[PDB]
Design a protein around this ligand. Structure first.
Ligand SMILES: [Zn+2]
Length: 201
């Protein structure tokens, strides 16, 4: 009787946000453990959403999602094909691309979106899930070097967060760190141009 007993994966749940509104960046939690679990099963999330960078959790993981041009983006290796909880119930992914490690849902009402960068700059800033703003020098279409290497633990759970231009535009989505000696010297990210192509294909 396994068919009657087969479970269903919960929804992704917003549990916080990275505040970039003012001059100081900090992480705010909006939902604790019990509420996160209940909201993941039901997919019904009545909480008000704000900001550009959300902190999101599954049953097994916590990571980031970033709104860009009306779409809330995150990594496939974190969210899989899961729905996201919303006031109206579970919301099905709008984009799913395992080959780019990218997924997206329609940006929740109340969120603010970042604009894709058009400057062509190479001086970047990575926002971590602890609201640290790490300077990152772009080294290629999808790679950047940390100006100050740090233990991998410092970046755990920042996948899906943004890399930002000097002018605050979105340059890419953080995908995975490059670690030698368990120290992170560089990062791989999904360039925003790749998101723009997905949004029009
Ligand atoms: Zn820019």
């Amino acid at each position: 009787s396994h068919m009657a007993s087969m479970k269903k994966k919960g929804s992704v749940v917003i549990v916080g946000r990275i505040n970039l509104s003012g001059d100081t960046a900090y992480a705010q939690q909006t939902r604790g453990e019990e509420g996160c679990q209940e909201t993941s099963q039901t997919g019904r999330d009545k909480n008000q959403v704000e900001g550009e960078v959300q902190i999101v959790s599954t049953a097994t993981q916590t990571f980031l999602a970033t709104s860009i041009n009306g779409v809330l983006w995150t990594v496939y290796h974190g969210a899989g094909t899961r729905t996201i909880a919303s006031p109206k119930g579970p919301v099905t992914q709008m984009y799913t691309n395992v080959d780019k490690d990218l997924v997206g849902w329609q940006a929740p009402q109340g969120s603010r979106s970042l604009t894709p960068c058009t400057c062509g700059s190479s001086d970047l800033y990575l926002v971590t899930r602890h609201a640290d703003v790490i300077p990152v020098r772009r080294r290629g279409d999808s790679r950047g070097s940390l100006l100050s290497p740090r233990p991998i633990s410092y970046l755990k759970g920042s996948s899906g967060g943004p890399l930002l231009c000097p002018a605050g535009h979105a340059v890419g989505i953080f995908r995975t760190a490059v670690c030698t000696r368990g120290v992170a010297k560089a990062v791989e990210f999904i360039p925003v141009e790749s998101l723009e192509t997905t949004m029009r294909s």
